[PDB]
């Protein structure tokens, strides 16, 4: 069970270069993610809500969240002037320079 | 069960160039992702929401929110002069130069 | 069972260059997203909302959000004079230059 | 990948009942047998003869046996008043005798 | 990859009954067998007769045997008055005698 | 990877019941066998037999026996009133006698 590669698996003679991703001036918020997640018989439960109640009476304001992940505010980027974020792979092989 | 592979997988005399993703100015809310995702003989429960209630009565204002990610707020990106986010991958192999 | 696979598999002699996505000025709200996932003999549930309840009475305002992901807000990106980003792949192989 | 199975694979309420082979007075002689055999991506080289040499010269007499499996001489089976060699299955189920 | 299953294998509510295989008088002489064999990925190289070389000479008398197996001889089975030698399997499952 | 079962595998509410071989008045001589026999990623060699000489010269009599197993002789079986070898099983499950 090979799963994750990069590269040379059961091979010979090979040149490989691989990049990977790149991030400027991004701003998430209340995120999720998974890369190269391998479950094997396994068994889970992630992120429930269960069982909420709210009540009001009377009252002039009620302002409530529930969740995973709550985010109430600000999330902000400002770039000026900005120069290089990337992945470079360079790869040379098997070379008669004669 | 050979899965994920970037590259040579029983192979031979291989000259593999691969690049990635790249991201330049992105504002993402409340967002899921699965890159890469293998399950075997797995059993799974993700993100449910389950037995919400919510009462009022003689109130002037009710403001809620469930979720299994809530985002009530500013996700904001600016750039200005920005220059250069991306993935680059060069390969060479068998080269007779004579 | 050889599934995701970039450059040889079970092969010879081969030049591969593959690129992959790009972004650049993307907003996204609540978006879900699988780019490469196996299941074998797995039993999965993914996001269910089940047994909300909602009253309300003599009230002057009810504002309420249930879900898998609640974005109440500016999701916003700005962009000025940005140059560049994206995903370059070269490859060379089996060269003679005599 | 379900592959050798004798019963109930993937079913419900099931009465299954399976025998097997026999063999009475039986005398083998350098057979060779596969039951239930799986390879998967595997690479073998079974029972091979190469290279061979045999020279005589002026001589009275010459007996050679090369092979995977030689037998020269007797494989005798004998029986008289011999009884009973056999497989027997029952199942019974799902009986409601009221 | 559930192989070899002999009853219930992701199932429910079963009665199963599985018998073997019986011998009774038998004689084998340089045999070989595989039952339930099962190869992943693997390499092997089994049984073979290479580089074999015989010389005679103004001899009266040569009698060579090269081989994996050589069975130069008697091989014998007598039986009288025998009585039972046989696989029985009985299932009973799911009975409501009221 | 569930490879060799006898019984339940990811199962509920079973009876089962499995026999096995027997064997009553056998001779085998220079026999191999596998049973129930599983490589993952292996690399094997068994049986080999190589490079081999035999030279004669003026000689009245030459016998040689080369091989993984060799048998010059008798193996021989004798029976008279012999009575049972056999293998049994009974199973009985969720009766209700009332």
Same mark, same amino acid.
């Not at 998974?34 to 302002?63: N, R």
């Not at 969740?67 to 974020?85: F, I, R």
């Given at each position: 069970?090979?799963?994750?590669?990069?590269?040379?698996?059961?091979?010979?003679?090979?040149?490989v270069?691989a990049? +990977?991703?790149?991030?400027q001036? =991004? @701003?998430?918020? #209340?995120? %999720? $993610?998974? /890369?190269? !997640?391998?479950? &094997? *018989?396994?068994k889970?439960? +992630?992120?429930v809500?269960?069982g =909420? @109640?709210?009540? #009001?009476? %009377? $009252?002039k /304001?009620? !302002?409530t969240? &529930? *969740?995973?992940a709550?985010?109430?505010?600000?999330?902000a980027?400002?770039?000026?002037?900005?120069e290089?974020?990337?992945?470079?792979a360079?790869?040379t *092989?098997?070379?008669?320079?004669?």
């Amino acid at each position: 069970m090979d799963v994750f590669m990069k590269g040379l698996s059961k091979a010979k003679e090979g040149v490989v270069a691989a990049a +990977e991703k790149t991030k400027q001036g =991004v @701003a998430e918020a #209340a995120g %999720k $993610t998974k /890369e190269g !997640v391998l479950y &094997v *018989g396994s068994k889970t439960k +992630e992120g429930v809500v269960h069982g =909420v @109640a709210t009540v #009001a009476e %009377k $009252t002039k /304001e009620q !302002v409530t969240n &529930v *969740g995973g992940a709550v985010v109430t505010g600000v999330t902000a980027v400002a770039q000026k002037t900005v120069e290089g974020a990337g992945s470079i792979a360079a790869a040379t *092989g098997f070379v008669k320079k004669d």
